[PDB]
Enzyme design. Structure first.
Site, PDB file in Angstrom:
ATOM      1  CG  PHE A  53      22.297 -19.553  20.037  1.00 51.69           C
ATOM      2  CD1 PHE A  53      22.274 -19.086  18.732  1.00 51.69           C
ATOM      3  CD2 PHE A  53      21.228 -19.246  20.880  1.00 51.69           C
ATOM      4  CE1 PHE A  53      21.210 -18.296  18.289  1.00 51.69           C
ATOM      5  CE2 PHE A  53      20.205 -18.453  20.443  1.00 51.69           C
ATOM      6  CZ  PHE A  53      20.185 -17.999  19.149  1.00 51.69           C
ATOM      7  CB  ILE A  55      23.249 -22.551  25.640  1.00 52.41           C
ATOM      8  CG1 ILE A  55      22.600 -21.360  24.945  1.00 52.41           C
ATOM      9  CG2 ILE A  55      22.311 -23.012  26.756  1.00 52.41           C
ATOM     10  CD1 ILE A  55      22.347 -20.150  25.769  1.00 52.41           C
ATOM     11  CG  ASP A 141      26.504 -25.158  14.685  1.00 54.07           C
ATOM     12  OD1 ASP A 141      25.340 -24.762  14.589  1.00 54.07           O
ATOM     13  OD2 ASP A 141      26.744 -26.377  14.727  1.00 54.07           O
ATOM     14  CB  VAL A 142      29.440 -21.411  19.355  1.00 52.14           C
ATOM     15  CG1 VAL A 142      29.172 -22.640  20.253  1.00 52.14           C
ATOM     16  CG2 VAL A 142      30.511 -20.463  19.943  1.00 52.14           C
ATOM     17  CG  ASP A 143      30.268 -27.016  17.508  1.00 55.18           C
ATOM     18  OD1 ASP A 143      29.427 -26.304  16.804  1.00 55.18           O
ATOM     19  OD2 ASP A 143      30.310 -28.280  17.362  1.00 55.18           O
ATOM     20  CG  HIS A 163      25.452 -31.783   5.848  1.00 53.93           C
ATOM     21  ND1 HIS A 163      26.466 -32.647   5.990  1.00 53.93           N
ATOM     22  CD2 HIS A 163      24.723 -31.858   7.022  1.00 53.93           C
ATOM     23  CE1 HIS A 163      26.427 -33.203   7.198  1.00 53.93           C
ATOM     24  NE2 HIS A 163      25.360 -32.744   7.838  1.00 53.93           N
ATOM     25  CB  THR A 175      19.388 -37.464   6.506  1.00 56.69           C
ATOM     26  OG1 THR A 175      20.150 -36.279   6.742  1.00 56.69           O
ATOM     27  CG2 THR A 175      20.319 -38.550   6.112  1.00 56.69           C
ATOM     28  CD  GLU A 233      21.202 -30.559   9.133  1.00 58.83           C
ATOM     29  OE1 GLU A 233      21.247 -31.824   8.976  1.00 58.83           O
ATOM     30  OE2 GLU A 233      22.224 -29.905   9.377  1.00 58.83           O
ATOM     31  CG  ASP A 256      35.324 -32.711  11.115  1.00 59.56           C
ATOM     32  OD1 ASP A 256      36.558 -32.775  11.235  1.00 59.56           O
ATOM     33  OD2 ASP A 256      34.534 -33.110  11.946  1.00 59.56           O
TER      34      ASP A 256
END
Ligand code: UDP
Ligand code: UDP
Ligand code: GAL
Ligand code: GAL
Ligand code: MN
Ligand code: MN
EC number: 2.4.1.40
Lengths: 276, 276
Positions: A53, A55, A141-143, A163, A175, A233, A256
């Site tokens: 996505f 957007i 995700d796109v990022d 995760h 979480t 999530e 990351d």
């Protein structure tokens, strides 16, 4: 086809868990011979659909995402990119390898970041088109950018991804949604892993099931005045607790380096967050 | 349902290979939580068919085989025993647990031990009856006894079992068929494992495929004047080289304590040879 002999008294990796207690492989470098897997998947003429996505401002992430996917994602296999965006003219024209196509799906923008991220489940589930066009769907995700191989090793009926902030943690630290009011509710004494919503997938049938279930669950939460704590999530994690994935990706597949470095247990960093 | 948390930085077993290079689990004690698997398989109302040949003197092995299968094999699940014999009146009447049935299939006896063992592939492939009656088929020798749990952990589309004499060996030591004249032929530089013909199985569709293929291959060898060196097991190993199994059983599932003892790497001895 000639390759190193697996030897049953020499494990590949002794440092990490490589199979879940329900006998799903956990995918780490050194667990798979890609030449074998590639052959198996090419024999079925496998087509992999990749949904993303973009957007609002997130269209800015598409050029690097698609360029790096061309370098690393399912190279040699058929790939169909599905880009969901409120801005079709903003999708960069990236040159694709043979056997690879991109479709732009125009969708509406929700104002809130919670509903943009959350309505992906709804948007993915658009149902007959995926069934006819691809064998598997991968939802990311796109990022992000691809930095190393992401290939047919991940393919299976249903997979989730560990995760990167919680893989060495105990379950009470997860979480998960903890309110029994929420469809996403998981008790403190339950839970296998904490999966990230940024990378999941499977066969088209299993992804349509998951996304339908998550959407139905979120609508129930809405009609009851509660929003799960980590939104899609939360529901992803409840679904995968009750319907256990048939492969789990290691954090090589969602990382990351800025926040978490490059620990020795990660031999490759394959798909990583872009600074934002 | 509450169980120990898997932890990704604590492996179950560090002493053995628990996944093949094509991401099929290799089934050892400590890799699986049986409570999880049992739930998954009971939710599908799984029926497991167990085929065993008892031709000539081998009817003597049925009482212990069936008694011990009642104790250890798929307990709690639906089980259909198929006993192929030239002597229906010699099948012992063993009392079965609820959800378990036995059928006696009368077949002809071949004179030679090679053709008795070899024509099992043909006999198994009888085709519409298995498809309607069971989800999985498990195909084992009768000169064996169950000594510990053999359960739904083994179930998958296609599995083979590591030969207990060769699991720590290098591939050039494998007693594959080495004559290019034979359909079972495997070159010296090829091969993953050496599977034993005494314990294989899978979904009914995949077992019918395997047994049809092996039978077609042996008929070709016959019409060409060659008998593969270890007969059905040669062809089984060629089939499983080219069509890789989706689980591999460890030697816990096929052992002989008299010949091989009880090594530390075997935490359980589940299915073992009877002296003969
Ligand atoms: O304004 C937005 C917010 C989110 N997203 C999509 O929803 C995904 C998840 O949101 P985000 O990456 O912001 O969540 P995070 O990784 O920060 O938790 C994004 O990758 C995009 O694919 C989007 O397209 N536009
Ligand atoms: O006279 C015979 C010889 C073989 N078999 C069947 O074929 C299987 C394989 O033969 P066997 O166990 O003799 O082979 P081994 O384990 O000695 O190599 C046996 O378990 C029986 O199920 C049989 O029923 N009667
Ligand atoms: O759920 C715990 C959270 O972990 C954070 O590190 C991440 O940014 C969030 O998106 C969410 O996954
Ligand atoms: O093929 C090598 C052989 O190994 C022997 O130990 C076994 O008795 C035979 O049945 C055959 O499997
Ligand atoms: Mn993101
Ligand atoms: Mn035998």
């Amino acid at each position: 086809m000639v390759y190193p002999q697996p030897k049953v008294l020499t494990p590949c990796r002794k440092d990490v868990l490589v199979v879940t207690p329900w006998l799903a492989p956990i995918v780490w470098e050194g667990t798979f011979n890609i030449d074998i897997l590639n052959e198996q998947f090419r024999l079925q003429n496998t087509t992999i659909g990749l949904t993303v996505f973009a957007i609002k401002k997130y269209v800015a992430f598409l050029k690097l995402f698609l360029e790096t996917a061309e370098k690393h994602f399912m190279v040699g296999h058929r790939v169909h990119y599905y880009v969901f965006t409120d801005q079709p003219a903003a999708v960069p024209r990236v040159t694709l390898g043979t056997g690879r196509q991109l479709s732009v799906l125009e969708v509406g923008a929700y104002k809130r970041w919670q509903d943009v991220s959350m309505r992906r489940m709804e948007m993915i589930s658009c149902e007959r088109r995926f069934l006819s066009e691809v064998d598997y769907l991968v939802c990311v995700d796109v990022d992000m950018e691809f930095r190393d191989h992401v290939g047919v090793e991940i393919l299976t009926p249903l997979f989730g991804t560990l995760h990167p902030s919680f893989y060495g943690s105990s379950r009470e630290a997860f979480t998960y949604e903890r309110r029994p009011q929420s469809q996403a509710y998981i008790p403190k004494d339950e839970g296998d892993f904490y999966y990230m919503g940024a990378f999941f997938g499977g066969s088209v049938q299993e992804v349509q099931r998951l996304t339908r279930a998550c959407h139905q669950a979120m609508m129930v939460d809405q009609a009851n005045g509660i929003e799960a704590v980590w939104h899609d999530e939360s529901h992803l994690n409840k679904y995968l607790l009750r319907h256990k994935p048939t492969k789990v990706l290691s954090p090589e597949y969602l990382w990351d380096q800025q926040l978490l470095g490059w620990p020795a247990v990660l031999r490759k960093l394959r798909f990583t967050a872009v600074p934002k």
